Design a protein around this ligand. Sequence first.
Ligand code: HEM
Ligand code: PIM
Ligand code: ZN
Length: 367
Amino acid sequence: MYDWFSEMRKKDPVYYDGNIWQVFSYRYTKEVLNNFSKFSSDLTGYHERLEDLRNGKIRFDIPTRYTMLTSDPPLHDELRSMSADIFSPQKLQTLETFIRETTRSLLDSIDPREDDIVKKLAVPLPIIVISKILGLPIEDKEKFKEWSDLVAFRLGKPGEIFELGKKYLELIGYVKDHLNSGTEVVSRVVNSNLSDIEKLGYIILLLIAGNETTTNLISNSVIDFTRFNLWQRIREENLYLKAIEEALRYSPPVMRTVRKTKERVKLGDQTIEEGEYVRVWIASANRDEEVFHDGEKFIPDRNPNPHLSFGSGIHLCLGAPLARLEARIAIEEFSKRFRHIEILDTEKVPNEVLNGYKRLVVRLKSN
Ligand code: HEM
Ligand SMILES: c1ccc(-c2cnc[nH]2)cc1
Ligand SMILES: [Zn+2]
């Protein structure tokens, strides 16, 4: 993928293939993401059917079609403002203890002889933490993951119709049946002027949408640090914070996102007409030579590091601070308890939008 990205950044930064437009450079990728007035996120019919949702004419529908992720202003802020401080520095600080204790416990279940860290650590951590933060109970652990997988899948394909399967129905039932136990943020959404469908969509987004991406950040970090033999230096120079950002830039959990033009727009040397879909390749922008010197090289102490892995503009990842914290703690604690790491087997998640691992089997030394 990266040799292709490179060639495109050089010859066709903004390329039209007759179906959609694709952007590969940092400059333009950032331009699209920030210019919400001309590059819309309204790709799931949220704005068009908002009215029939609010007045109740629409009763059965896909909740995830209606979240802030696929809304433009002013609806966007009306939604985001309700949870904009859900991961406040003060709240996160209080959670560090929970996250650390949790991480320590997950690490204790690992059999050093041979075990899958995606299963034992990368997958569990985010679920346990978001569950704690939102107040929604972890019961059937396999179902939680199933929901994590399906939601991430759908979010990567905005506008593509998919009927509510059994699993999704169980997800919806679960949320409906546990809203009462929800915390502050959840109560604010439940007691708002949003239609039921929206409340369900909003809760699903907060509770499940960030699990697979954070899991991938953790998995990708382990892989990179190991591939490039950086563990020793990271511990020694305390590059955790910087090295995790390099991991976000070098191996982004989300490879790209989507936008639609609302009007004729000039992007680079190209002119894009109205109603066109624009695939923004975050993964490619993150390696742009202009912005990141020696961009194809992993530099653990790279700084500053303005990667676009959390996006940019009004939709900048609401969960960025939490994802960063969980990743930092998982990596920090992992490096301390384990002396050496040997990767025995790996299996990648077959997906174009999400970049991570389904299995990461390793052999470790303690102390
Ligand atoms: C390392 C993991 C993560 C990555 C790389 C990631 C990436 C992103 C990106 C690129 C966007 C913007 C997409 C666009 O502009 O179309 C975004 C939006 C968002 N993310 Fe994440 N995310 C991560 C973790 C999380 C977590 C932990 C949560 C929540 C528990 C979360 C919640 C959200 C929400 C709600 C939005 C919508 C923001 C808005 O539309 O205003 N993310 N994320
Ligand atoms: C596809 C695209 C984005 C996401 C996401 C962003 N933040 C949390 N999940 C998940 C799947
Ligand atoms: Zn229950």
